[PDB]
């Protein structure tokens, strides 16, 4: 899990993004997408149940006191529900990753938006 005080909630809006890459390419689909940006107060935690884990310090993280999280697919259906300005925490069922919301990761495919392919903290 994470929290996150995110204060940007950026345009579902048709944009060219990557595709997976080496194997059979397609065309960059006008896919409507769109991502969000979030200030940071405490980082990844632990699923403690009834508790949670530590909200890890972005103290010795410089960079990207916010954060660029994006969203197609399923995660088109959670658009509406964010209003900017509010802190929001995001759950994960899924094996435990921390310096996780910095740089795309590998349990996906390795498609990257057009700007925030690695911009800031994709």
């Not at 595709?19 to 107060?41: D, H, I, R």
Request: glycine fraction near 10%; hydrophobic fraction near 35%; aromatic fraction near 10%.
């Amino acid at each position: 899990s994470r929290l996150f005080l995110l204060c940007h909630k950026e345009a579902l809006m048709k944009r060219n993004f990557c595709v997976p890459p080496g194997a059979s390419p397609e065309v960059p689909k006008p896919a409507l997408s769109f991502y969000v940006l979030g200030s940071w107060l405490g980082g990844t935690q632990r699923k403690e149940g009834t508790g949670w884990g530590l909200p890890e310090p972005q103290g010795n993280d410089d960079n990207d006191q916010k954060v660029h999280l994006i969203f197609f697919g399923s995660s088109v259906r959670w658009f509406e529900f964010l209003h900017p300005g509010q802190v929001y925490r995001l759950i994960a069922p899924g094996p435990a990753t921390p310096m996780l919301f910095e740089k795309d990761g590998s349990s996906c495919i390795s498609r990257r938006p057009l700007e925030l392919a690695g911009c800031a903290s994709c």
